[PDB]
Design a protein around this ligand. Structure first.
Ligand SMILES: C[C@@H]1Nc2nc(N)[nH]c(=O)c2[N+]2=CN(c3ccc(C[C@H](O)[C@H](O)[C@H](O)CO[C@H]4O[C@H](COP(=O)(O)O[C@@H](CCC(=O)O)C(=O)O)[C@@H](O)[C@H]4O)cc3)[C@H](C)[C@@H]12
Ligand SMILES: C[C@@H]1Nc2nc(N)[nH]c(=O)c2[N+]2=CN(c3ccc(C[C@H](O)[C@H](O)[C@H](O)CO[C@H]4O[C@H](COP(=O)(O)O[C@@H](CCC(=O)O)C(=O)O)[C@@H](O)[C@H]4O)cc3)[C@H](C)[C@@H]12
Ligand SMILES: [Cl-]
Ligand SMILES: [Cl-]
Ligand SMILES: [Mg+2]
Ligand SMILES: [Mg+2]
Ligand code: NA
Ligand code: NA
Lengths: 369, 369
């Protein structure tokens, strides 16, 4: 353990101290969840320095944290810098605890130019590893073939008792390696050296189980498993029938949200009807997920009916996504198909809109002359 | 009400008496849910005859119900026949309480040839209205432009107290009319005349809220609404961010099931990790859906780990379906795009495999000579 850490002790660079006002004031984590500030990136840095690593924390904004919190960071042995280039030249592992949007991609492009050989660039919850890879792909493929992309996603707020793990993005479900095994193993080593359980998951799936949306994934998964058990044990429906129903429902809901938002999706799937319909699926003594859902739909039903009749169901073409991917790959086949897929994959995983806001364009024009 | 029924009293044809052994013995509905046999199609026929309509029930298999149950049907005033053609020539509304697979499409093709002018053909849970329309489309477009497609989906087992409603398929989310307003209004009239609440929903969505999969839809919907409320009230995340997370999660889960089944999907989305990750989303005093899900995942976790390591994550290309539909419509655009979409829509909604089983081909070859 300690003897092993000495052999594998490495240089680590964390980018982004974490928005402490968000953690302490808006979320009130010390009272709601536990622990003590700082939280986030600066906390990950403290934990890695506490584990014996040479940690550099790159934060350009000194006012994001009070001076007392900064001392906690400095007292841990973390070297704070304001220049990303200084931190890029340092680590062999770079954790992006950076803001949603342009900032994460801008910093990733700045560091890939100065990272040491075989370094790995790790995302957190503000970006998907797939989208991070797509943005650095031209450099990764030609200039830096040695650089790897993975995750060091806390899937929790570092500094809270809930943070006892890390999600590390591995080979994708489409069989694509964004990083070498050695680089992924080094990410696992870093995680475990800070007393955190290391979870290596397909990179494309990491966001789905690590981000705030994991709430929807957990709930929906329990519904799928409840239905799967009822379907096979009580209904004795064939597995392919149960699978067809699961895909049909989950895919319809995603696509309605995609075109018409949550409100429009609720307008298409009537909660009142769903309560009545799903009630004939109460076939077991304990279906706590179904009972909880029906009461939630029932309680929210009166309030929902108001805004949903204001909502609009925008044109939706409900299709089975993988089946449609397979068809374009045979109808079109090649590079044209690759582009249409990469763009649809990016639309699914992009956390922030890549295009500049109307104000940004107007502000730039105001300062033009 | 009664005076109104006399003006709108109409001829009704129900196809399929309902598998009584399933309802009474395998499901034991009299004791588990309530009511008295018969259930299903023959019950829908009784209720429609009880409402004053001239009902014909077409059932080729007399042994599907005991003689006492048949008397209940005959005593209601329902004319039982064994020839579908005799019932097709009768009603102006045809309800398909037929078996999963080939049988439903075969009967629908037999009746469209003899249905009276302006008749409407209604599906139940064994077929999707979209797939039913696709199978009769060449005849509907050329010979019978007057015929309409809709649903008379009980979204419950007729004969149980839970059956107090009907889902009637209306214009699709893609803005397509499978039936005229008058035909849909007649379906609503038939439903309401039997004391049932009429729910008109987009035809493509009807299965998602009416079928056994409504269990998954209800649960997942409560998870989405829980996350939506937490996201906006506690996290104060923008709506587009909440929407992105909802789509990303629901679409990933559907696609994993599509390529790798439930087991493979559970192998990709680690339940143990999800429990830990989703626990940092317990931001409100009451989140009964999340708490129920975490205990279900926790209880099922030990059992799942056994078969999931046996499971395989088959190649999956995660993309946002609607975004990918929009791209093929501009890259390809025309008829080629229509075909690829109609086929992907059919794969999503088809309840049974359209292709003949290996045994069927082998049996046919055995009786060839
Ligand atoms: C309590 C939440 N619980 C989580 N749980 C998991 N498993 N994964 C996450 O990732 C989680 N979080 C993400 N967070 C979060 C906070 C603010 C914005 C909103 C963002 O700040 C926008 O820019 C508001 O404007 C978005 C996400 C919270 C820290 C934190
Ligand atoms: C209790 C179920 N609750 C329902 N609830 C809703 N809201 N909608 C339905 O549609 C429901 N059902 C569909 N059922 C059902 C029964 C057997 C097979 C399996 C089928 O018989 C296969 O062929 C087995 O083999 C498939 C579905 C049950 C009657 C009934
Ligand atoms: Cl230098
Ligand atoms: Cl005749
Ligand atoms: Mg919305
Ligand atoms: Mg399976
Ligand atoms: Na930079
Ligand atoms: Na027939």
């Amino acid at each position: 353990n300690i003897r092993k850490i000495k052999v594998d002790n490495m240089k680590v660079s964390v980018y982004g101290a974490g928005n402490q006002n968000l953690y302490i004031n808006k979320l009130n984590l010390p009272e709601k969840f536990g622990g003590e500030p700082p939280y986030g990136g600066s906390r990950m840095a403290i934990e890695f320095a506490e584990a014996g690593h040479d940690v550099v924390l790159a934060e350009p904004n000194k006012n994001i944290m009070s001076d007392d919190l900064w001392k906690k960071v400095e007292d841990a042995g973390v070297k704070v810098v304001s220049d990303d280039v200084e931190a890029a030249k340092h680590g062999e592992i770079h954790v992006l605890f950076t803001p949603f949007g342009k900032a994460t991609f801008r910093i990733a492009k700045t560091i890939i130019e100065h990272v040491p050989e075989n370094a790995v660039i790790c995302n957190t919850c503000t970006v998907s590893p797939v989208v991070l890879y797509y943005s650095l792909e031209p450099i990764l493929r030609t200039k830096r073939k040695d650089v790897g992309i993975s995750s060091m996603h806390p899937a929790a707020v570092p500094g809270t008792p809930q943070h006892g793990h890390y999600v590390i993005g591995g080979k994708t479900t489409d069989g694509k390696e964004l990083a070498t095994e050695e680089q992924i193993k080094k990410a696992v080593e870093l995680a475990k050296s800070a007393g955190k359980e290391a979870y290596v998951v397909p990179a494309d799936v990491s966001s789905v189980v690590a981000d705030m949306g994991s709430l929807v994934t957990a709930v929906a998964l329990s519904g799928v498993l409840d239905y799967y058990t009822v379907g096979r044990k009580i209904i004795n429906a064939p597995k392919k029938m149960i699978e067809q129903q699961v895909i049909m429902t989950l895919q319809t809901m995603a696509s309605l949200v995609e075109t018409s938002g949550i409100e429009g999706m609720v307008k298409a799937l009537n909660p009142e009807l769903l309560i009545r319909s799903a009630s004939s699926m109460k076939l077991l003594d304990r279906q706590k997920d179904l009972d909880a859902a029906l009461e939630i739909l029932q309680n929210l039903d009166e309030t929902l009916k108001a805004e949903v009749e204001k909502a609009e169901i925008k044109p939706t073409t409900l299709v089975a996504a993988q089946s449609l991917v397979k068809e374009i790959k045979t109808l079109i086949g090649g590079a044209a198909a690759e582009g249409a897929i990469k763009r649809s994959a990016r639309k699914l995983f992009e956390h922030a809109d890549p295009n500049s806001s109307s104000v940004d364009k107007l502000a730039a024009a105001l300062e033009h002359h």
